[PDB]
Design an enzyme around this catalytic site. Sequence first.
Site, PDB file in Angstrom:
ATOM      1  N   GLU A 175       7.275  11.934  70.976  1.00 50.77           N
ATOM      2  CA  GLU A 175       6.471  10.887  70.299  1.00 50.77           C
ATOM      3  C   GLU A 175       6.712  10.944  68.789  1.00 50.77           C
ATOM      4  O   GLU A 175       7.236  11.963  68.327  1.00 50.77           O
ATOM      5  CB  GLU A 175       5.011  11.095  70.666  1.00 50.77           C
ATOM      6  CG  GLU A 175       4.747  10.986  72.154  1.00 50.77           C
ATOM      7  CD  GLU A 175       5.185   9.674  72.781  1.00 50.77           C
ATOM      8  OE1 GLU A 175       5.158   8.646  72.084  1.00 50.77           O
ATOM      9  OE2 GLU A 175       5.550   9.683  73.967  1.00 50.77           O
TER      10      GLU A 175
ATOM     11  N   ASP B 117      -3.685   9.594  62.409  1.00 53.17           N
ATOM     12  CA  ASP B 117      -4.749   9.768  63.444  1.00 53.17           C
ATOM     13  C   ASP B 117      -4.866  11.246  63.814  1.00 53.17           C
ATOM     14  O   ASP B 117      -5.849  11.607  64.469  1.00 53.17           O
ATOM     15  CB  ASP B 117      -4.528   8.906  64.688  1.00 53.17           C
ATOM     16  CG  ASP B 117      -5.825   8.328  65.242  1.00 53.17           C
ATOM     17  OD1 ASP B 117      -6.910   8.855  64.905  1.00 53.17           O
ATOM     18  OD2 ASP B 117      -5.757   7.304  65.937  1.00 53.17           O
TER      19      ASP B 117
ATOM     20  N   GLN C 243       1.788   8.916  56.070  1.00 53.76           N
ATOM     21  CA  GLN C 243       2.426   7.640  55.697  1.00 53.76           C
ATOM     22  C   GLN C 243       1.403   6.519  55.808  1.00 53.76           C
ATOM     23  O   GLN C 243       0.616   6.527  56.759  1.00 53.76           O
ATOM     24  CB  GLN C 243       3.647   7.310  56.558  1.00 53.76           C
ATOM     25  CG  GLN C 243       4.332   5.981  56.188  1.00 53.76           C
ATOM     26  CD  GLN C 243       5.556   5.751  57.033  1.00 53.76           C
ATOM     27  OE1 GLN C 243       5.588   6.137  58.193  1.00 53.76           O
ATOM     28  NE2 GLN C 243       6.563   5.094  56.473  1.00 53.76           N
ATOM     29  N   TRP C 244       1.386   5.613  54.827  1.00 50.74           N
ATOM     30  CA  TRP C 244       0.603   4.366  54.956  1.00 50.74           C
ATOM     31  C   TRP C 244       1.403   3.183  54.388  1.00 50.74           C
ATOM     32  O   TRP C 244       1.370   2.945  53.149  1.00 50.74           O
ATOM     33  CB  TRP C 244      -0.799   4.534  54.352  1.00 50.74           C
ATOM     34  CG  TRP C 244      -1.663   3.423  54.848  1.00 50.74           C
ATOM     35  CD1 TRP C 244      -1.868   2.214  54.251  1.00 50.74           C
ATOM     36  CD2 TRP C 244      -2.300   3.351  56.136  1.00 50.74           C
ATOM     37  NE1 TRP C 244      -2.633   1.411  55.061  1.00 50.74           N
ATOM     38  CE2 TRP C 244      -2.916   2.077  56.222  1.00 50.74           C
ATOM     39  CE3 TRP C 244      -2.418   4.226  57.224  1.00 50.74           C
ATOM     40  CZ2 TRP C 244      -3.660   1.674  57.337  1.00 50.74           C
ATOM     41  CZ3 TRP C 244      -3.127   3.815  58.338  1.00 50.74           C
ATOM     42  CH2 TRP C 244      -3.756   2.565  58.384  1.00 50.74           C
TER      43      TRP C 244
END
Length: 300
Positions: free
Chosen positions: A231, A201, A28-29
């Site tokens: 998370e 990341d 996702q961006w």
Amino acid sequence: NRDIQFTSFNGKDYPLCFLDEKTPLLFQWFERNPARFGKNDIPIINTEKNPYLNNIIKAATIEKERLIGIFVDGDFFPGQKDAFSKLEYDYENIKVIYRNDIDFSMYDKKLSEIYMENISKQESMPEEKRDCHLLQLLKKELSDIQEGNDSLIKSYLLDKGHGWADFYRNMAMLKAGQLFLEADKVGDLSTNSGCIYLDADMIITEKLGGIYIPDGIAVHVERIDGRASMENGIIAVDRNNHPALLAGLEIMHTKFDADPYSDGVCNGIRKHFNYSNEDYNSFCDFIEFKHDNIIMNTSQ
């Protein structure tokens, strides 16, 4: 393969389902400041300490047989969209999917409906256990509702924090493999509609191989000094509309100002498995996504 396997949590057995080596990945961006990138550059941060596009290209180059989604939003310059089209041309398994091109209406609710059910929930609340201020804010927000703005999905397009990306990610993950089908980016299955969400990341250091996740869902668990937490970096689903994410969506439809991360994922997964009173830790080793091939850009 041929035989379903099981795992136990709290003495109940649960089916393990198997995400094969073709299961798609989704990155996702969602970009607030496209203006920070060159006008014909890929508008994803790619620096030595933050090599997010490189991480995505590495996954694509390692997992040749997987579709690799990049779910993107933000006001990109037309030459940055051109850069994205070149990326798809260069790497035939990378598929860029604009939030704008996907219909999320099947998961919408009117803000008026959430506000009023919350008011009724409080106003009817037996004593003065009521959050005086929540009751007061709800009635005023119910009033300032524009004609084409009574949408829980549109409201998250104005979210000023992490909620803009995390809410849409949950709904992308309710669509799962059907996201690629909806965006005409498949070159899949009416059954094999699983998907693995990865934060940019995360680095795949070599081939993932088949994965077993319980009752068709697993999440990133992080451990620091022997305490575990769920998370948002990794969400693996067995199929579209996975019941745990619908549970999460149900909370997002009922709890006013629900957190898309702790309510939309964690609490939803919790309700699906009816947890609560037992060890968070033992639950976290149960729900944890097992990979051992996905490090972050903070390791040696």
